[PDB]
Design a protein around this ligand. Structure first.
Ligand SMILES: CCCCCCCCCCCCCCCCCC(=O)OC[C@H](COP(=O)([O-])OC[C@H](O)COP(=O)([O-])OC[C@H](COC(=O)CCCCCCCCCCCCCCCCC)OC(=O)CCCCCCCCCCCCCCCCC)OC(=O)CCCCCCCCCCCCCCCCC
Ligand SMILES: CCCCCCCCCCCCCCCCCC(=O)OC[C@H](COP(=O)([O-])OCC[N+](C)(C)C)OC(=O)CCCCCCCCCCCCCCCCC
Ligand SMILES: CCCCCCCCCCCCCCCCCC(=O)OC[C@H](COP(=O)(O)OCCN)OC(=O)CCCCCCCCCCCCCCCCC
Ligand SMILES: CCCCCCCCCCCCCCCCCC(=O)OC[C@H](COP(=O)(O)OCCN)OC(=O)CCCCCCCCCCCCCCCCC
Ligand SMILES: CCCCCCCCCCCCCCCCCC(=O)OC[C@H](COP(=O)(O)OCCN)OC(=O)CCCCCCCCCCCCCCCCC
Ligand SMILES: *C(=O)CCCCCCCCCCCCC
Lengths: 177, 13, 122, 128, 459, 65, 79, 87, 155, 99
C-alpha cells in the first residue's frame, strides 16, 4: 500500500501483519499474562489451520474474512507503546531535538567553552564535504535511466568511500537529547 | 562520567 | 419516600402538596393553640450577623454556639455541647415540620372520608 | 454475520477492509510501481539537495508553492459566474446579512417600544 | 502643533545631509526625540480640547494617535534598514523621505481643526504610501495592490470632498470647534441619506468595512515592512478618527443609516476571523485579523455611546501596536526563509526561543488577554453593543472564540511542532529584531498600568 | 546506597519506605477506628427519625366526625 | 557497568497459572512455547500478592492495636 | 532512572528471551543463528520473537523493519540503532 | 519556480490533462481535477480527502510532523487535514451508530431530567417556619409599613 | 527473508559512522571550559522587607483614603462588653429548656 522499498505488501506480509495486530489487540482484551497466553495459543492454532493453503484465491478470501473478524473484535483502546505513534510519550522529545547545523551559528565565546568538541566537529564536516562529490557520482553512475525505481540507497562500494546520503542519518539527534 | 554534548541553538544573542 | 409513591402513583387529592400547605386553619382541631415562642431578640440575631436561613425559632442556641466557638479559640473541639444543643433544637423543629405534614395528610383523609360519607348518605 | 463497516466522510474505510487492497492484477502492480517510481524520483531529488554540504537555505518545494498559488491567486482566473456560484454567493453572502438585520432590527424595535412605553426596567442603567 | 511639524520636516535635511553610514542612526535618533517630545500633547482637560491655533487642535482622541504615529517612525526605520541594506543610497534616502513625509501628513491629519484640511492631509497620505508599496514592495502584485489601495480610497473620498464643501456652503464653516456648537439635526430624507453616505464611505473604505476590505489583503501583504506597519497601525485609524469627527454632523439619521453597516461589520468580523483559520500566507492572516479587529471599531463608532467610543479608541491604539508587532514578527521569519507561507518554517521555538516569547506575547495581546488595552477596548465595545442589542453578544462571543483560535494556530504552526528539516538558515535573533519587538510590546503592556490616556475625549 | 535495578525479579526495597507506608496505613486505620468510636453518628445517624403513623390524633388535632 | 542477569533455567512454569494454561492447552492438543518467558511474573517476590480486601486492610493490625491502647489510655485518664 | 543500554546488555537480553522460547534449544542458539535457515522456525514464530523483543525492551518495531530481523544480531543492531547505544 | 509549473485553468484536452498530471508529479490515471463548475480550482488535483493522521507514521516522511513528502501534491485542504485538526481515521464504531447512541443518550437524559423536574422528590415536612412575620425586616421590608401577622403555632 | 546484502552492508556502514558520531558527543574532562568567575536572609528579604513595605503602603497611603480597606464589623453576642463604650450587651432570655 505505502512502503519505501516495496511497491506493495505481499500476501504473506499481509497475513503476518494481521497476526501481529490480532495478537496485540488480543493482549489488550486479555490483560492478564496467562489468559493472554492461552488465547494467543488458540489464535496461533487458528492461523496454523490454513497455513498450508495452496489456492491463493481461497487464501485471499480467508485473509479478507479474517480482517472482518479482526475489525469486529478489535479493542477500542488497544495498548500503544509510549514512544509509538498514538502513544502518550510519542514525539515528546522533538522539542529537544535541535539539529546539528545550529552549532554553526554559535558565538565564538560559547564555541570556546567546548574546544575539543568543535575541533572534532570540524573533521566530521571535512569528511562530509570530501565525501559528497564521490557519493553524488556514485549515485548517478548506479541509478538507471529514468530515475530510481525504489527509495533504497546503495552502500559504499570502495574502501575509503562513505555510503551515499549519509549525513542526516548519522548526525540525527538522539531520542533522548 | 559519560557526559554528552547537548545540541542547542545559540543562546548568546 | 413512601409518600412520593402515594402522591405520584396513588391519588394526589389525599396527599398534601408541599409548595402550598397548610391549607387548613391552624385552630381547626385545636382548642387554645399556643404560638411558638422566639427566644432570641431580633436585634440580638441582627448583631450576631446570622444568616437569614439561620434566624429561625432556634437561633438562640446558634448564638450560644457561635459565642462559644469564638471564645474557645484555638481549641476548635471545645464546643460540642452547644453545637449538639443547636442540632437537637433543629431536630425538634424538623419533627414539628413532620407533625405539620402528618396533620395536613390526616385532615385531607378526613375531607376524603367526609365527602365519601356525604356521597353515600345523600 | 458481522456488522459491515459503513464509511462516512469523517470516518473513512480501513485499508484492511477495502476490496481493492487485495487486487493482484498486473495493471495495479504497474500503477503501484509507477507511483513508487515517482515517489523515489522525488525522494532522490529532495535528498540530493537536503544532504548537500554547500547548501544553506530553504529547499524550495514547488508543490508547496503550487498549493499556495492555487489557494489564492488562481481562484478568480478560474471563476465562472453560473447558477451554482451565483446561488451560493447570494445564499452565503447576503443571506446572513438579511437574517441578522431582521433579528437586530426586531429586537431594537421591540426594546425601543418598551422604553418609550415605560415598560423596560432601566432602573440602574446609567452606563451605556 | 508647529513644534512637531517643523522637527518632522527637519528630518528631511537630516536624512539628506547625513553621511552614508549614518542615515539610519541619525533619523532613528531624532525621530525618537520627536516621539519623546510628543508627550506634551497630554495636556488635556476634562472640558476643553487643547486648541493651539486656528489651524490645529488636539483632544484626547487625536493625542494617542499622534503619539503612536510619532512612535512608529523609529520602529519603521529599524524594521526597514536590514532589507534595504543593499539599496542605492539615494533610493534609501528617498524611502526615508517617504516615511518622514507620511509622518508629516499624518500628524496634521489628526490635528486638523478644519475638515477640508483634514481631507487634504488625509488624501495626501495616499501618495507616500502608494510610492512605498509600489516601489519597495517585493513582488509583482504590489503594482496591482497599489491600484486597489489608490482607487478604493478615492472613489470613496471624492464624494466626501463634495459633501464637506456642501457643509462649507451650508454651515459657513468646517471648523470642528464651530461645528460643535452650530450642528443642526440631520433629518430623514434622500438628500440627507446620500449626504450620510458621502460623509461616511471614505472612512468605511479606510477602516475597512467588510465588503470594501479587498484592497487591504493586497496592500498590507505586498507592502514592505514599514509600509505594512504604517498601514495597519495608523492609516486604518484615519477612518475611525474621521468617523468620530464626522458623526457629529450626522445625527439623528445615523440611528438608521448605521443598520446595514453594523450588519456588515458584525457578520464581517465573523467572516474575516474565520478566514484567518484557513490562511496559508502568514502576512495575509495578520491583514485579515486587522479587518476583523477594525469591524469592532466600526460597530462602536456607529452605535455612538460613551462606552463604545472609549472602547473604539482604546482598540485602535492597541491594534496599532499589536498588528505592527505581528507584521514585524512575520517579517523576521520572512527575512530568514524568504517566503510568507506559514506552514513552511515550523518549530521555531526550538531554534529561536526569545523570538518565540515575542510571538507568544503578541498572540496573547491579539486574542485580547486581560488586562491588556486590547482587552479593554474589546470589552468596552462588547459592553456597549450588548446595551445596543443583547443578541450581539452571540456574534461578539463567537468572534472571541475564533480570534483565540486563529491567534494560537498562528502560534502553533510557526513556533511549535517539529522544525522543518531542510531549512538550515535560521539565524539567531538579531539585537535589532528583539529591540523592534520590545519597542512594540513594552509600551503596549505599560499602557495597561494607565489606560486613561488612550480612552479618548469622553473618558 | 541507591537502588540498583534488577532483572525479572522483585526490586530492592528500603526499610524506610516500608516503615513509612506501614505507619501511614496504621495511622489511617487508627483514625477511622478512633473517630468511629467517638463520633458514631456522622455515619449511623444523629437523632431518631420519628414514625408519623405512631402519632395520635390528639396531639395533631384531628376531630373525629 | 556490566549487569548480571539471573539464570534462565530457574524460570519454570510448574507451580504457576502457566501450568494450568499448559494443561488446558494440552487437553486440546496444543502447547505454549512462551511460558517460561512469562514465568518470572508469577515467581519470586511477585508471587502471592494480596487480595483487594487485604489491600484495604493494610495496617489494620497496628492501627487496631494503637486504637485499643488509646481507648484504654483515655479510659484510665478519665478516672 | 532509565539505566543506559549496552551492546552486551542488549545481546544478553535478546539471547535470554530466545533461550526462554520452547521452539529454540538454548545450546544451538548463537547471535548469528538464522531463525528460518538455522533454527527451522516459521514466519509466525519470527513475528512472535519480534513481539517478545518489543515486550522485552518496551518499544515497537514496525512491520517493515520486523520482517527483516532474521537473526539475534540483527535484532541487537536494530535496538542499538533505535536507542543510540555506545555514545 | 516558473509559469508552466504553476496551477492553471481546467484541463480539457487529454494532452492538457497529461501535462498537468506531469506538473503535479503524479500519474495521469491518478490525476483527477475538481469538476469544472466555476468555483476556482483550476487544474489542481482532487486528492482523496483523507487526514494526515491516516498516513503511515513509520514511513520516513520528509516532513514527519505533517506526514508529507517533498514534491508530493498537497491536498487543497492540507491546512485543514493537519494532525492538529480534522481527523478522518476509521472509527471502531460506525459513524451513524455513534450519532444514534450519542443523540439517544443526551435526549433520554434531558427527557428524564424534565420528568424528574415535573415529579420532584421531597421530604414529608411542612414549610420552614421563621419568626417576626417571616423575617419581614430582615428580608428588606420597610419599617414604615406593617405586614400582615405571620403567626406560627406549636405542634 | 530478511535483508538483501546491499541493505546489510549499508546498515553496517551507517552503523559504524553513527556509533563514531555518538562517541564524538562525549565531553572532554576539561569541558565545559568555563570563563573565570546570612542564614535566614530569605525571611528578611522575602518576608520582612515586604511586610515593612506593604504595612507602610497600607497604613499611610491606603487607609488614609476612604473606603479602601472596609472591614466587616465585628460580630456582637449577648454578654459581650464593647471596648469603645463599656456598654455590656445584655444576655438572652432564659431558655425554655428542652433536655
Ligand atoms: C512603570 C513601571 C512599570 C514596572 C513594572 C512592569 C510592568 C509591565 C511591563 C511589561 C513587562 C514585560 C517584560 C517581560 C516580557 C518581555 C521580554 C521577555 O520575554 O523576557 C524574558 C526574560 C526572561 O526570560 P529568559 O529565561 O531569559 O528567556 C525567555 C525564554 O526565551 C522563554 O520565555 P518564556 O515564554 O518562558 O517567558 C515569557 C513569559 C510568558 O508568560 C506568558 O506569556 C504568560 C502571561 C499571561 C498569563 C499570566 C499573567 C496574567 C495577567 C496577570 C498580570 C497582570 C495583572 C496583575 C495585577 C493583579 C490583578 C489585577 O512572560 C513572562 O514571564 C513575563 C511576565 C510578565 C507578563 C505580563 C503579561 C503578558 C501577557 C500578555 C498581555 C496580558 C495583559 C497585559 C498585562 C500588563 C500588566 C502591567 O525577561 C527579561 O529578561 C526581562 C527584561 C526586562 C523587562 C523590563 C520590563 C519593563 C519595561 C518597561 C520600561 C520602561 C518603564 C521602566 C520599568 C522597568 C521595570 C524593571
Ligand atoms: C468606495 C465605493 C463607494 C463610494 C460611495 C460614496 C458615497 C455614495 C453616495 C454619494 C452620492 C453623491 C455625493 C453626495 C453628496 C451629498 C451632498 C448633498 O448636499 O447632498 C444632498 C443633495 C440635495 O440637493 P441640494 O442640497 O442642492 O438641494 C437643496 C436641499 N433640498 C433637497 C431640500 C431641496 O443631493 C443631491 O443633490 C444628490 C445626491 C445624490 C447624488 C446621486 C449621484 C451619485 C450617485 C452615487 C455615486 C457614488 C460613487 C460612484 C462610483 C463608485 C466607484 C467607481
Ligand atoms: C442568477 C443566476 O442563475 O445567474 C446565473 C448567470 C449565469 O448563467 P449560466 O449558468 O452561465 O447559464 O450568472 C449571472 O447572471 C451573473 C451573476 C448574477 C448576479 C449574482 C448576484 C449575487 C452574487 C453574490 C453577491 C455576494 C456579495
Ligand atoms: C458589496 C460590498 C459591501 C457593501 C458596501 C456598502 C454598500 C451599501 C451602502 C448602502 C446601504 C443601503 C442603503 C442605506 C439604508 C438605510 C435605510 C434605508 O434607506 O432604508 C431603505 C428604504 C426604506 O424607506 P424609507 O425609510 O421610507 O426612506 C424614505 C426616506 N425619506 O427603502 C426604500 O426606500 C426602498 C429602496 C430604494 C432604493 C435605495 C437605493 C439607494 C441606496 C443604496 C445605494
Ligand atoms: C450551560 C450551557 C452548556 C452548553 C453545553 C453545550 C454547548 C456547546 C456544544 C458543543 C460546541 C463545542 C464543541 C465542538 C468544538 C470542539 C473542537 C475541538 O475540541 O476540536 C478538537 C480537534 C481535535 O481533537 P481530538 O481529535 O480530540 O484530539 C486527539 C489528538 N489528535 O481539534 C481540531 O479539530 C482543531 C480545530 C480548530 C478550529 C475549530 C473550529 C470550531 C469552532 C467552534 C466554535 C463554536 C462557538 C459556539 C458559540 C456559542 C455561543 C453561545
Ligand atoms: C421516599 O422514597 C423518600 C426518599 C427520597 C426519594 C427516593 C430516593 C431513592 C434513592 C435513595 C435510597 C437508595 C437506597 C439504596
Amino acid at each position: 500500500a505505502f512502503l519505501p522499498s516495496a511497491a506493495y505488501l505481499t500476501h504473506q506480509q499481509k497475513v503476518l501483519q494481521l497476526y501481529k495486530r490480532a495478537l496485540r489487540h488480543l493482549e489488550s482484551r486479555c490483560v492478564h499474562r496467562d489468559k493472554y497466553r492461552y488465547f494467543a495459543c488458540l489464535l496461533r492454532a487458528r492461523f496454523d489451520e490454513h497455513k498450508n493453503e495452496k489456492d491463493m484465491v481461497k487464501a485471499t478470501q480467508l485473509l479478507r474474512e479474517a480482517e472482518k473478524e479482526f475489525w469486529h473484535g478489535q479493542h477500542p483502546q488497544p495498548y500503544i507503546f509510549p514512544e509509538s505513534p498514538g502513544g502518550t510519550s510519542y514525539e515528546r522529545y522533538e522539542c529537544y531535538k535541535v539539529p546539528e547545523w545550529c552549532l554553526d551559528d554559535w558565538h565564538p565565546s560559547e564555541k570556546a567553552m567546548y574546544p575539543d568538541y568543535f575541533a572534532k566537529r570540524e573533521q566530521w564536516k571535512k569528511l562530509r564535504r570530501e565525501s559528497w562529490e564521490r557519493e553524488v557520482k556514485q549515485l548517478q553512475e548506479e541509478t538507471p535511466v529514468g530515475g530510481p525505481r525504489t527509495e533504497a540507497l546503495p552502500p559504499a562500494r570502495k574502501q575509503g568511500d562513505l555510503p551515499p546520503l549519509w549525513w542526516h542519518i548519522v548526525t540525527r539527534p538522539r531520542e533522548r537529547p | 562520567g559519560k557526559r554528552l554534548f547537548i545540541i542547542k541553538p545559540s543562546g548568546f544573542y | 419516600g413512601a409518600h412520593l409513591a402515594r402522591r405520584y402513583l396513588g391519588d394526589a387529592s389525599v396527599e398534601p402538596e408541599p409548595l402550598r400547605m397548610p391549607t387548613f386553619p391552624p385552630d381547626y382541631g385545636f382548642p387554645e393553640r399556643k404560638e411558638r415562642e422566639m427566644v432570641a431578640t431580633q436585634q440580638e440575631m441582627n448583631d450576631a450577623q446570622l444568616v437569614l436561613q439561620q434566624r429561625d425559632y432556634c437561633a438562640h442556641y446558634l448564638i450560644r454556639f457561635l459565642k462559644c466557638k469564638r471564645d474557645s479559640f484555638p481549641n476548635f473541639l471545645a464546643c460540642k455541647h452547644e453545637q449538639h444543643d443547636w442540632d437537637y433544637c433543629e431536630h425538634l423543629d424538623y419533627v414539628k415540620r413532620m407533625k405539620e405534614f402528618e396533620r395536613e395528610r390526616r385532615l385531607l383523609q378526613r375531607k376524603k372520608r367526609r365527602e365519601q360519607r356525604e356521597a353515600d348518605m345523600a | 454475520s458481522f456488522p459491515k463497516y459503513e464509511p462516512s466522510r469523517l470516518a473513512s474505510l480501513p485499508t484492511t477492509l477495502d476490496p481493492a487492497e487485495y487486487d493482484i492484477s498486473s495493471e495495479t502492480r504497474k500503477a503501484q510501481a509507477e507511483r513508487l517510481a515517482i515517489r523515489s524520483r522525488l525522494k532522490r531529488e529532495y535528498q540530493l539537495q537536503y544532504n548537500d554540504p554547500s547548501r544553506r537555505g530553504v529547499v524550495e518545494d514547488p508543490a508547496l508553492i503550487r498549493w499556495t498559488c492555487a489557494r489564492s491567486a488562481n481562484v478568480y482566473p478560474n471563476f465562472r459566474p453560473n447558477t451554482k456560484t451565483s446561488l451560493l454567493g447570494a445564499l452565503f453572502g447576503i443571506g446572513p446579512l438579511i437574517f441578522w438585520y431582521y433579528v437586530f432590527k426586531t429586537d431594537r424595535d421591540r426594546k425601543e417600544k418598551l422604553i418609550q412605553e415605560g415598560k423596560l426596567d432601566r432602573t440602574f442603567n446609567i452606563s451605556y | 502643533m508647529l513644534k512637531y511639524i517643523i522637527p518632522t520636516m527637519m528630518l528631511m535635511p537630516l536624512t539628506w545631509l547625513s553621511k552614508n553610514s549614518m542615515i539610519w542612526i541619525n533619523t532613528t535618533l531624532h525621530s525618537l526625540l520627536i516621539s519623546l517630545t510628543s508627550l506634551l500633547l497630554l495636556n488635556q482637560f476634562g472640558d476643553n480640547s487643547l486648541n493651539f491655533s486656528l489651524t490645529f487642535f488636539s483632544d484626547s482622541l487625536s493625542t494617542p494617535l499622534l503619539i503612536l504615529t510619532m512612535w512608529l517612525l523609529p520602529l519603521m526605520l529599524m524594521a526597514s534598514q536590514h532589507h534595504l541594506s543593499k539599496e542605492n543610497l539615494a533610493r534609501k534616502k528617498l524611502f526615508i523621505s517617504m516615511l518622514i513625509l507620511l509622518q508629516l501628513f499624518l500628524i496634521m491629519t489628526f490635528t486638523a481643526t478644519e475638515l477640508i484640511f483634514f481631507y487634504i492631509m488625509f488624501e495626501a497620505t495616499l501618495v507616500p504610501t502608494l510610492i512605498i508599496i509600489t516601489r519597495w514592495g517585493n513582488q509583482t502584485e504590489r503594482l496591482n495592490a497599489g491600484l486597489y489601495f489608490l482607487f478604493y480610497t478615492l472613489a470613496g473620498s471624492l464624494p466626501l470632498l463634495v459633501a464637506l464643501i456642501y457643509i462649507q456652503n451650508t454651515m459657513g464653516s468646517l471648523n470642528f470647534l464651530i461645528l460643535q456648537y452650530w450642528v443642526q439635526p440631520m433629518p430623514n430624507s434622500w438628500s440627507n441619506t446620500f449626504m450620510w453616505l458621502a460623509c461616511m464611505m471614505a472612512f468605511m473604505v479606510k477602516m475597512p468595512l467588510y465588503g470594501l476590505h479587498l484592497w487591504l489583503p493586497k496592500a498590507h501583504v505586498e507592502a514592505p515592512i514599514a509600509g505594512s506597519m504604517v498601514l495597519a497601525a495608523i492609516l486604518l485609524k484615519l477612518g475611525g478618527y474621521g468617523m468620530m469627527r464626522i458623526t457629529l454632523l450626522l445625527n439623528p439619521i445615523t440611528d438608521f443609516m448605521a443598520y446595514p453597516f453594523i450588519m456588515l461589520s458584525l457578520w464581517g468580523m465573523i467572516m474575516t476571523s474565520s478566514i484567518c483559520l484557513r490562511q496559508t500566507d502568514l502576512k495575509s492572516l495578520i491583514a485579515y485579523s486587522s479587518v476583523s479587529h477594525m469591524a469592532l471599531v466600526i460597530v462602536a463608532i456607529l452605535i455612538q455611546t460613551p462606552w463604545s467610543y472609549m472602547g473604539a479608541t482604546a482598540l485602535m491604539i492597541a491594534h496599532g501596536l499589536t498588528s505592527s508587532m505581528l507584521f514585524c514578527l512575520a517579517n523576521s521569519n520572512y527575512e530568514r526563509v524568504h517566503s510568507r507561507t506559514m506552514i513552511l518554517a515550523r518549530g521555531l521555538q526550538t531554534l529561536l526561543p526569545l523570538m518565540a516569547a515575542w510571538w507568544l506575547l503578541a498572540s496573547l495581546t491579539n486574542l485580547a488577554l486581560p488586562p491588556s488595552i486590547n482587552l479593554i477596548g474589546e470589552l468596552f465595545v462588547v459592553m456597549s453593543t450588548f446595551s445596543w442589542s443583547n443578541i450581539t453578544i452571540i456574534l461578539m462571543g463567537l468572534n472571541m472564540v475564533i480570534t483565540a483560535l486563529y491567534s494560537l494556530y498562528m502560534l502553533i504552526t510557526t513556533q511549535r511542532g517539529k522544525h522543518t528539516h531542510h531549512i538550515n538558515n535560521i539565524l539567531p535573533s538579531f539585537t535589532r529584531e528583539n529591540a523592534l519587538m520590545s519597542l512594540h510590546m513594552l509600551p503596549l503592556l505599560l499602557l495597561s498600568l494607565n489606560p486613561k490616556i488612550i480612552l479618548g475625549p469622553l473618558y | 546506597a541507591h537502588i540498583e535495578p534488577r532483572y525479572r525479579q522483585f526490586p530492592q526495597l528500603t526499610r524506610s519506605q516500608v516503615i513509612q507506608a506501614e505507619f501511614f496505613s496504621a495511622t489511617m486505620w487508627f483514625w477511622i477506628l478512633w473517630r468511629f468510636w467517638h463520633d458514631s453518628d456522622a455515619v449511623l445517624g444523629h437523632f431518631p427519625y420519628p414514625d408519623p403513623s405512631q402519632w395520635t390524633d390528639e396531639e395533631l388535632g384531628i376531630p373525629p366526625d | 557497568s556490566k549487569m548480571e542477569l539471573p539464570d534462565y533455567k530457574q524460570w519454570k512454569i510448574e507451580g504457576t497459572p502457566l501450568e494450568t494454561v499448559q494443561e488446558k492447552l494440552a487437553a486440546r492438543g496444543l502447547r505454549d512455547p512462551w511460558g517460561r518467558n512469562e514465568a518470572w511474573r508469577y515467581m519470586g517476590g511477585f508471587a502471592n500478592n494480596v487480595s483487594f480486601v487485604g489491600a484495604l486492610l493494610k495496617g489494620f493490625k497496628w492501627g487496631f492495636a494503637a486504637f485499643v491502647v488509646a481507648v484504654g489510655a483515655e479510659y484510665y485518664l478519665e478516672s | 532512572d532509565a539505566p543506559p543500554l549496552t551492546l552486551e546488555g542488549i545481546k544478553d537480553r535478546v539471547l535470554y528471551v530466545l533461550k526462554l522460547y520452547d521452539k529454540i534449544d538454548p545450546e544451538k542458539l548463537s547471535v548469528n543463528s538464522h531463525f528460518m535457515k538455522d533454527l527451522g522456525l516459521d514466519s509466525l514464530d519470527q513475528v512472535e520473537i519480534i513481539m517478545a523483543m518489543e515486550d522485552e525492551f518496551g518499544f515497537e518495531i514496525p512491520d517493515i523493519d520486523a520482517e527483516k530481523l532474521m537473526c539475534p544480531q540483527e535484532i541487537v543492531d536494530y535496538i542499538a540503532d533505535k536507542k543510540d547505544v555506545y555514545e | 519556480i516558473t509559469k508552466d509549473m504553476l496551477p492553471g485553468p481546467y484541463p480539457k484536452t487529454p494532452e492538457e490533462r497529461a501535462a498537468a498530471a506531469k506538473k503535479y508529479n503524479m500519474r495521469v490515471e491518478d490525476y483527477e481535477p475538481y469538476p469544472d463548475d466555476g468555483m476556482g480550482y483550476g487544474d489542481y488535483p482532487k486528492l482523496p480527502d483523507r487526514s494526515q493522521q491516516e498516513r503511515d507514521p513509520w514511513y520516513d516522511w520528509d516532513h514527519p510532523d505533517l506526514r508529507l513528502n517533498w514534491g508530493e501534491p498537497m491536498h487543497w485542504d492540507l491546512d485543514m487535514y493537519i494532525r492538529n485538526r480534522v481527523d478522518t481515521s476509521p472509527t471502531p464504531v460506525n459513524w451513524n451508530l455513534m450519532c444514534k447512541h450519542l443523540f439517544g443518550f443526551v435526549a433520554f437524559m434531558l427527557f428524564m431530567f424534565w420528568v424528574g423536574e415535573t415529579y420532584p422528590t421531597y421530604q414529608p415536612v411542612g414549610p420552614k417556619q421563621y419568626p417576626y412575620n417571616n423575617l419581614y425586616l430582615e428580608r428588606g421590608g420597610d419599617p414604615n409599613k406593617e405586614p400582615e401577622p405571620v403567626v406560627h403555632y406549636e405542634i | 527473508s530478511g535483508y538483501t546484502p546491499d541493505e546489510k552492508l549499508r546498515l553496517q556502514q551507517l552503523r559504524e559512522l553513527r556509533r563514531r558520531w555518538l562517541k564524538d558527543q562525549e565531553l572532554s574532562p576539561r569541558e565545559p571550559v568555563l570563563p573565570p568567575r546570612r542564614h535566614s536572609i530569605f525571611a528578611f528579604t522575602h518576608v520582612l522587607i515586604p511586610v515593612w513595605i506593604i504595612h507602610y503602603y497600607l497604613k499611610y497611603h491606603v487607609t488614609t483614603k476612604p473606603y479602601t480597606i472596609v472591614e466587616k464589623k465585628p460580630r456582637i453576642f449577648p454578654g459581650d462588653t464593647i471596648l469603645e463604650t463599656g456598654e455590656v450587651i445584655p444576655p438572652m432570655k432564659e431558655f425554655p429548656d428542652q433536655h
